[PDB]
Amino acid sequence: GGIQTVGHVVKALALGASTVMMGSLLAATTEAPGEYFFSDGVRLKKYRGMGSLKIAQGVSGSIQDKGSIQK
Amino acid sequence: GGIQTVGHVVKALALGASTVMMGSLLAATTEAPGEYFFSDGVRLKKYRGMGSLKIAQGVSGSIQDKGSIQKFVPYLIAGIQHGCQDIGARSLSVLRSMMYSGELKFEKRTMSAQIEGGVHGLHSYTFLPFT
Amino acid sequence: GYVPEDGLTAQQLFASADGLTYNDFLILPGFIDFIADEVDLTSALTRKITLKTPLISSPMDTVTEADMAIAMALMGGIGFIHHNCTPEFQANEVRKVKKFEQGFITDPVVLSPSHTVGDVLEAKMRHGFSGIPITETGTMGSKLVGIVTSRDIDFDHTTLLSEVMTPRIELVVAPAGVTLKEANEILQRSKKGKLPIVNDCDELVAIIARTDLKKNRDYPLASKDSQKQLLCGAAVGTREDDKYRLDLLTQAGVDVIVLDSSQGNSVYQIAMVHYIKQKYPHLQVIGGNVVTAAQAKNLIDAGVDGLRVGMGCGSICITQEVMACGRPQGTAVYKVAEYARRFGVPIIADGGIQTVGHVVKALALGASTVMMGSLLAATTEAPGEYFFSDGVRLKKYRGMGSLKIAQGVSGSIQDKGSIQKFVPYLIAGIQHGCQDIGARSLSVLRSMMYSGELKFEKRTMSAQIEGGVHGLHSYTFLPFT
Amino acid sequence: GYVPEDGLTAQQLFASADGLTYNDFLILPGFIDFIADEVDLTSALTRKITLKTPLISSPMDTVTEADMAIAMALMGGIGFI
Amino acid sequence: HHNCTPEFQANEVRKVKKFEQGFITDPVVLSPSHTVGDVLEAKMRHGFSGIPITETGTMGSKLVGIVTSRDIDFDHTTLLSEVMTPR
Ligand SMILES: NC(=O)c1ccc[n+]([C@@H]2O[C@H](COP(=O)([O-])OP(=O)(O)OC[C@H]3O[C@@H](n4cnc5c(N)ncnc54)[C@H](O)[C@@H]3O)[C@@H](O)[C@H]2O)c1
Ligand SMILES: Nc1nc2c(ncn2[C@@H]2O[C@H](COP(=O)(O)OP(=O)(O)OP(=O)(O)O)[C@@H](O)[C@H]2O)c(=O)[nH]1
Ligand SMILES: Nc1nc2c(ncn2[C@@H]2O[C@H](COP(=O)(O)OP(=O)(O)OP(=O)(O)O)[C@@H](O)[C@H]2O)c(=O)[nH]1
Ligand SMILES: Nc1nc2c(ncn2[C@@H]2O[C@H](COP(=O)(O)OP(=O)(O)OP(=O)(O)O)[C@@H](O)[C@H]2O)c(=O)[nH]1
Ligand SMILES: Nc1nc2c(ncn2[C@@H]2O[C@H](COP(=O)(O)OP(=O)(O)OP(=O)(O)O)[C@@H](O)[C@H]2O)c(=O)[nH]1
Ligand SMILES: Nc1ncnc2c1ncn2[C@@H]1O[C@H](COP(=O)(O)OP(=O)(O)OP(=O)(O)O)[C@@H](O)[C@H]1O
Ligand SMILES: O=c1[nH]cnc2c1ncn2[C@@H]1O[C@H](COP(=O)(O)O)[C@@H](O)[C@H]1O
Ligand SMILES: O=c1[nH]cnc2c1ncn2[C@@H]1O[C@H](COP(=O)(O)O)[C@@H](O)[C@H]1O
Ligand SMILES: O=c1[nH]cnc2c1ncn2[C@@H]1O[C@H](COP(=O)(O)O)[C@@H](O)[C@H]1O
């Protein structure tokens, strides 16, 4: 987590991490589950946090379409 | 052209058009040509008017992604025929017969009544057309 | 001694076909010779059912779980239960809306004196009801043994229930066949309230509770049927399997149903009105959304007991822009209420109502009641949850056509607090504007409508930009609510 | 047994020259006695050519390279290059 | 908060102390000669409603009975001894 660009992936590999685990950067790719909805002229797809429904330790949000994970 | 929702297609057909013709509503489908650019956080694809580069008589702009035309056209079909049902017509030929026979009846929607559906009466919203 | 008549009469507006809505017109003021809160509001819902107030909650899933039905029926109105859920759930909802206050309770939870007291705590958690009579076989077909009370469970559990209940020798009781005005007095004068009813054989037949006398004192305007319990409504769809849903709702004791549709005129709907009114002769039925008199004729011929009117006009809606088919709400409500009035059926004005002025307009145009969506969303008893977003305590507002095609949006509304304080503000805003109009009751108001005494004027767009205008830097409202 | 006719007919709208567009009017609802997907859509494009659906893609450079012509002709419509 | 007259702030802290109690040591009490409309007045003025009755209407007197909200479901006018529960 906290990875949001390719540069952050290279930084995380050149620091000891053997692999990097992606959340937001793969949300709203085509095969991430669910549905796309126009909010304000944007084809965004949901991005729920597991701690976002005892207390809530995540938010729930949405991300713009990124197309197929194959590309 | 000038058609920007499925309701405008049913209106154009119930007025004597044999077909509609689409521009912006098919731009930014997957098989519309060219490339996508993320801009201010939106996966939009270019939309150029032919008169937009002696004088310029169109603009050059952009449209948000609508996915494959292979799913979009069945949504237009299933929205036309589902509104042709409410009109009461069993085919588009019957619909234009109703047009020219006086059986269809219209009313003028004064400006104040154009501010209806998806109105100035929500904080914020998301549509989700089946698309 | 002569003063010129000013302003268009009722009929002169809707002759020129400009398709007016509630924003496009005003109602000219009259003469005032009564106090603002004097005026009556009694209004028919359907031919046989009448409400002490003209407000109804819309049957959307985002508005009417049972808690709103209760809190709105308790203040004159009526509540319709949303239909987009399994029939068993909707039957439970309408059942626990009926059971919030009672006359002769005729099917109480009852226990055998052999139970463990931890089973009283189980029953109290499972039903909320907590002052339970005891009978030998733990059913209505048995002799009265005693009563157990929340006042008996301040004490681990384990005890047999005969040790802690109060026995039949010591409690007060009344003989069966008593009417619900003598039994009420006998409970009042035997000032310890849970009075059971037993026949001459001393076996349990019914009970009464003081809490419902307390509710009668507290909510004088509530709409209760003959058995002295709240009136309840269900939406149902027109589909072949909603024919099963109907039986569960009727066994749960629903009083009214609305045949929920985007377009009321269908051969499927007209066939279902016949099925309802042939199988269940008691039920009142309300017809699906109509906008023109040419389609009200089919519903009234079918046998419907009222109509709801308007389509595509609404906050959450997008049906005009997907179907191309609709009608501006102000024209529709008058042009169908004038026709439907000839047959004596009520009309209810369905949605597109977003301030108290739109309610006074809808009633002074022939609607027997209004029906509310967005104006009751984000009240406390509208179902679900609140989320802070961009610093606002907003609660969801889903259109049913919003997830084959989608004909509503899904959105959210800022908090409005408890419906218990909001409905009296609508009532005190309606009746206070009915004073300025000059009408002593809503029946008089529609008589003025149809007699030409009321006079309107068209408010051109440049005059809609009035009140709260482009003439303040920034501002705050405060409806006292 | 009589129900008043409500609403302007087709010709009565465009007699008063206010230059209406698709936003300015509605179509009043009728009677329904068929399923929503029963309705036929066959429509002429020109005197000799007919299409199973009334949709056409506009001949703009930003809309109709061959891949849209294919994907639209495959679903009733037609595509102009 | 302190930006208000001392009398108001003393009332505030007093009705914060009196929301739950052990031995209530200074209850509202009445003489049996009162009119029942004075019980409704006291209930509206204090919120408290289950009131004991004593011969001189003060703590320095013999008990006579109690009156409760369960005794006021009935215009007013009656002498309070008719409607109490007795000692
Ligand atoms: N004014 C509005 O648009 C409005 C208001 C409230 C709710 N809704 C909701 O939107 C939906 C709109 O569709 P609907 O109103 O036609 O009801 P519906 O959802 O039951 O009908 C869905 C489709 O099936 C058809 N249909 C309905 N009953 C049928 C039957 N018995 N046999 C065969 N086909 C049948 C209809 O023509 C429609 O095309 C409804 O589910 C309703 O709950 C709409
Ligand atoms: N046990 C019980 N008694 C009630 C209830 N509601 C009303 N009663 C009383 O039982 C009687 C009902 O008979 P009615 O004469 O038809 O009712 P009412 O006089 O119009 O009184 P309201 O309906 O409350 O305005 C009244 O005295 C009511 O005050 C209730 O919910 N439970
Ligand atoms: N008697 C009885 N009342 C029921 C039942 N189901 C719902 N109720 C309603 O629940 C109401 C309140 O229940 P009570 O038992 O009076 O509540 P309570 O335990 O005295 O305690 P409070 O809620 O504090 O008054 C009753 O007056 C009825 O309207 C049932 O099975 N039996
Ligand atoms: N009449 C009355 N009795 C109380 C009240 N609070 C506690 N009691 C009971 O009186 C007793 C108080 O004496 P303590 O032994 O010092 O209190 P405790 O055992 O610590 O109980 P808590 O303080 O409630 O946790 C307890 O049994 C309490 O349960 C009260 O507010 N009013
Ligand atoms: N006894 C008494 N209690 C007081 C007084 N002032 C405040 N109270 C508090 O108010 C609480 C509740 O009053 P109750 O008389 O028990 O309330 P109630 O009238 O019986 O009716 P409910 O509130 O429904 O139980 C008491 O337990 C005290 O904590 C007072 O002068 N006398
Ligand atoms: N019919 C009756 N006649 C006399 N006493 C009764 C009767 N029914 C119940 N009681 C008893 O009188 C006492 C008060 O009962 P009541 O129903 O008023 O308590 P409650 O309303 O449940 O109390 P609470 O409001 O504190 O929870 C209890 O001991 C109860 O068992
Ligand atoms: O709800 C949540 N609360 C807290 N951490 C979460 C939650 N859901 C996921 N995570 C973590 O947050 C990371 C998000 O990845 P990111 O979106 O790429 O930054 C995940 O890989 C998890 O480690
Ligand atoms: O540059 C231009 N100037 C003017 N009209 C244009 C131009 N390019 C395309 N059009 C029109 O725009 C239509 C596309 O539909 P539209 O997206 O609704 O506007 C086309 O079919 C043409 O009629
Ligand atoms: O999804 C939908 N599509 C169409 N109409 C709807 C939908 N959901 C609710 N409605 C209408 O919206 C009304 C709610 O009142 P409103 O908030 O003023 O719009 C309801 O009573 C219905 O008439």
Side-chain angles (χ1 to χ4, degrees):
Chain A
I3 292 142
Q4 63 204 0
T5 187
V6 162
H8 291 182
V9 181
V10 166
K11 289 177 180 170
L13 294 187
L15 279 195
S18 302
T19 66
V20 292
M21 177 179 280
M22 318 298 287
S24 298
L25 212 71
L26 300 182
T29 61
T30 302
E31 43 274 287
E35 68 218 326
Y36 320 84
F37 46 87
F38 302 105
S39 183
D40 191 18
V42 189
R43 203 210 185 198
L44 39 71
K45 172 173 284 183
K46 199 69 172 281
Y47 189 53
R48 191 187 298 115
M50 173 58 187
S52 202
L53 295 81
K54 179 165 59 75
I55 69 185
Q57 73 281 74
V59 314
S60 295
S62 202
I63 308 290
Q64 64 278 7
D65 190 352
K66 286 185 178 288
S68 63
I69 203 165
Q70 302 281 6
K71 282 294 193 292
Chain B
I3 291 170
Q4 73 192 4
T5 183
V6 174
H8 292 179
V9 180
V10 179
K11 289 176 181 171
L13 295 170
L15 279 195
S18 310
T19 90
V20 292
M21 172 181 277
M22 318 303 283
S24 177
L25 214 75
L26 302 182
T29 60
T30 303
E31 42 275 285
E35 69 197 351
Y36 317 87
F37 47 91
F38 286 96
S39 189
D40 195 20
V42 185
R43 202 212 188 197
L44 40 75
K45 171 170 284 182
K46 199 69 174 280
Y47 192 50
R48 184 191 299 122
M50 172 55 192
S52 204
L53 300 83
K54 179 165 60 74
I55 70 185
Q57 75 279 71
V59 311
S60 291
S62 205
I63 304 291
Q64 64 278 6
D65 193 351
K66 287 185 179 285
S68 70
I69 205 168
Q70 307 265 357
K71 276 290 193 290
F72 196 73
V73 168
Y75 159 76
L76 268 46
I77 288 169
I80 290 163
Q81 69 191 6
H82 198 305
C84 192
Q85 194 205 27
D86 291 0
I87 302 288
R90 184 173 276 93
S91 169
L92 298 178
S93 306
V94 166
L95 181 64
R96 292 186 297 267
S97 159
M98 276 193 186
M99 185 66 203
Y100 293 138
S101 178
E103 208 174 357
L104 270 186
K105 304 217 156 305
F106 308 132
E107 278 206 341
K108 307 197 313 288
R109 188 170 67 156
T110 285
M111 172 51 172
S112 320
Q114 303 193 125
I115 317 303
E116 300 300 346
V119 314
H120 304 160
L122 303 175
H123 171 280
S124 51
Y125 73 95
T126 56
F127 177 18
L128 209 179
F130 187 85
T131 310
Chain C
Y2 188 57
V3 65
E5 262 183 2
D6 285 309
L8 300 172
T9 196
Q11 188 181 12
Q12 284 160 218
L13 269 194
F14 308 95
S16 53
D18 289 350
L20 308 188
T21 193
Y22 305 135
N23 283 355
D24 291 304
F25 68 88
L26 288 164
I27 311 179
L28 282 196
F31 178 73
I32 301 171
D33 69 1
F34 52 89
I35 308 292
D37 61 14
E38 184 75 314
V39 305
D40 206 346
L41 296 175
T42 50
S43 299
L45 208 199
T46 53
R47 294 185 187 277
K48 299 188 182 182
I49 286 175
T50 186
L51 306 181
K52 300 289 184 73
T53 277
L55 275 290
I56 304 195
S57 47
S58 177
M60 298 164 70
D61 65 339
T62 191
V63 190
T64 54
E65 214 83 309
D67 296 358
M68 191 173 294
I70 297 297
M72 180 146 268
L74 281 177
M75 293 180 183
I78 191 71
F80 288 99
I81 302 299
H82 71 107
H83 79 82
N84 76 332
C85 62
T86 197
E88 300 75 18
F89 180 43
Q90 206 196 10
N92 168 34
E93 294 293 328
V94 80
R95 185 281 310 188
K96 77 187 179 74
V97 176
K98 290 293 282 180
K99 297 204 190 289
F100 182 91
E101 81 178 78
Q102 286 275 21
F104 292 114
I105 295 88
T106 298
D107 187 17
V109 186
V110 321
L111 300 171
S112 318
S114 62
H115 283 77
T116 292
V117 84
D119 219 340
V120 181
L121 289 169
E122 171 62 23
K124 187 270 181 180
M125 188 182 73
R126 189 170 291 261
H127 297 287
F129 166 57
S130 191
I132 287 155
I134 310 301
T135 75
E136 296 191 351
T137 325
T139 185
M140 302 303 290
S142 281
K143 300 189 76 82
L144 204 189
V145 174
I147 291 176
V148 72
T149 325
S150 184
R151 196 163 287 203
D152 302 321
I153 323 298
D154 195 330
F155 300 126
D156 180 18
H157 297 172
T158 201
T159 186
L160 180 143
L161 187 56
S162 191
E163 186 61 25
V164 306
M165 68 87 186
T166 192
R168 187 267 171 274
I169 300 105
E170 299 199 334
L171 51 65
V172 82
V173 60
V178 66
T179 190
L180 191 47
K181 184 162 221 183
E182 183 188 359
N184 196 356
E185 177 75 30
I186 291 294
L187 188 153
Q188 286 277 141
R189 284 221 291 110
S190 181
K191 56 172 60 75
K192 302 182 190 77
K194 258 292 173 165
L195 183 142
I197 310 297
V198 303
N199 71 348
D200 64 355
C201 200
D202 286 24
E203 83 165 12
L204 192 72
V205 297
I207 64 185
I208 63 165
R210 183 192 213 86
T211 311
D212 298 356
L213 274 43
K214 198 183 298 182
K215 292 177 197 303
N216 188 1
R217 282 202 302 103
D218 214 333
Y219 294 140
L221 277 296
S223 67
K224 286 162 287 171
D225 68 345
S226 58
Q227 283 64 20
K228 292 301 174 186
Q229 40 191 349
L230 303 188
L231 279 172
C232 310
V236 305
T238 303
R239 204 65 57 75
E240 177 60 12
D241 52 349
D242 290 316
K243 213 194 314 288
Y244 159 71
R245 182 194 291 279
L246 226 304
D247 200 15
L248 278 294
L249 266 47
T250 305
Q251 289 172 40
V254 75
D255 307 291
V256 188
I257 70 172
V258 57
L259 287 164
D260 194 5
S261 171
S262 177
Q263 178 33 251
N265 199 25
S266 73
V267 76
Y268 321 115
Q269 178 141 16
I270 207 185
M272 188 150 178
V273 178
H274 277 135
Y275 182 80
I276 303 299
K277 201 147 287 297
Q278 194 288 359
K279 185 167 178 175
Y280 302 104
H282 317 297
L283 263 62
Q284 300 291 264
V285 183
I286 301 171
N289 292 55
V290 300
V291 285
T292 187
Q295 93 193 164
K297 196 194 62 169
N298 295 327
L299 279 304
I300 307 322
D301 273 13
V304 92
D305 308 277
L307 293 168
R308 82 177 193 194
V309 311
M311 78 181 280
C313 189
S315 177
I316 202 64
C317 196
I318 199 159
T319 297
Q320 288 190 12
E321 302 306 329
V322 175
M323 308 297 182
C325 182
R327 179 86 160 277
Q329 184 64 16
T331 286
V333 67
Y334 165 65
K335 206 155 281 293
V336 80
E338 179 263 4
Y339 169 78
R341 180 270 299 229
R342 301 176 190 181
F343 295 83
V345 302
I347 294 305
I348 74 184
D350 182 3
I353 293 172
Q354 78 199 4
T355 182
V356 173
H358 293 178
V359 182
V360 177
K361 290 175 178 172
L363 298 181
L365 279 195
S368 311
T369 91
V370 291
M371 171 182 279
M372 317 303 284
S374 177
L375 213 74
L376 301 182
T379 60
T380 301
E381 42 274 285
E385 66 198 13
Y386 318 84
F387 46 86
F388 285 100
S389 185
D390 197 22
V392 184
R393 204 212 188 196
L394 41 75
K395 170 172 285 182
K396 200 71 172 277
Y397 190 50
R398 184 191 297 124
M400 172 56 188
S402 204
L403 296 91
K404 178 162 56 76
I405 69 182
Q407 73 282 74
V409 312
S410 294
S412 200
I413 311 290
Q414 69 282 0
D415 196 346
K416 287 186 177 286
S418 66
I419 203 167
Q420 309 265 356
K421 275 291 196 289
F422 195 81
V423 166
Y425 158 73
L426 269 45
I427 289 168
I430 290 162
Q431 79 187 355
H432 193 289
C434 192
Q435 188 195 35
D436 292 356
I437 302 288
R440 183 171 276 92
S441 170
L442 296 172
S443 306
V444 166
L445 181 64
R446 294 187 297 268
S447 159
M448 276 193 186
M449 185 66 203
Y450 293 138
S451 178
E453 208 174 357
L454 270 186
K455 305 217 156 305
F456 307 132
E457 277 203 349
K458 306 198 310 288
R459 186 172 68 158
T460 288
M461 173 51 167
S462 315
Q464 302 193 124
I465 318 305
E466 297 300 344
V469 314
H470 305 159
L472 303 173
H473 179 276
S474 52
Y475 77 95
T476 59
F477 176 25
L478 208 185
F480 184 68
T481 304
Chain D
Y2 188 57
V3 65
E5 262 183 2
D6 285 309
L8 300 174
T9 196
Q11 188 181 12
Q12 284 160 218
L13 269 194
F14 308 95
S16 54
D18 293 346
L20 308 187
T21 194
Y22 305 134
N23 283 358
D24 293 303
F25 71 88
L26 289 164
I27 311 179
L28 282 196
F31 180 68
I32 301 179
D33 73 353
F34 54 92
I35 311 295
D37 62 17
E38 182 65 3
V39 354
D40 202 353
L41 298 180
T42 50
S43 298
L45 205 205
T46 55
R47 295 185 185 279
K48 298 188 178 183
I49 286 174
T50 189
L51 304 177
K52 302 294 187 73
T53 278
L55 276 290
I56 303 195
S57 47
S58 177
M60 299 164 68
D61 64 343
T62 191
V63 189
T64 54
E65 214 84 308
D67 297 3
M68 188 170 297
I70 297 297
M72 180 147 268
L74 280 177
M75 293 180 183
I78 178 60
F80 288 96
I81 301 299
Chain E
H1 71 108
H2 81 83
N3 74 331
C4 61
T5 197
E7 300 75 16
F8 180 43
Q9 205 195 12
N11 168 34
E12 294 293 328
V13 82
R14 184 282 310 189
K15 77 187 179 74
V16 176
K17 291 294 282 180
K18 298 201 191 289
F19 182 91
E20 80 177 78
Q21 282 278 22
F23 293 116
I24 294 88
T25 296
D26 188 14
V28 188
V29 319
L30 300 171
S31 316
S33 62
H34 284 79
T35 293
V36 80
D38 220 336
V39 177
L40 288 171
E41 170 62 23
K43 186 269 177 178
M44 191 183 75
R45 189 170 291 263
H46 296 285
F48 164 58
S49 191
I51 288 159
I53 311 300
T54 73
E55 294 192 342
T56 323
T58 183
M59 296 297 288
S61 281
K62 299 188 76 85
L63 257 186
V64 189
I66 292 172
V67 71
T68 59
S69 184
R70 201 165 286 205
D71 302 305
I72 324 293
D73 195 330
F74 303 120
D75 184 22
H76 297 173
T77 201
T78 186
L79 179 144
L80 186 57
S81 190
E82 183 59 23
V83 305
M84 70 157 71
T85 188
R87 186 268 171 271

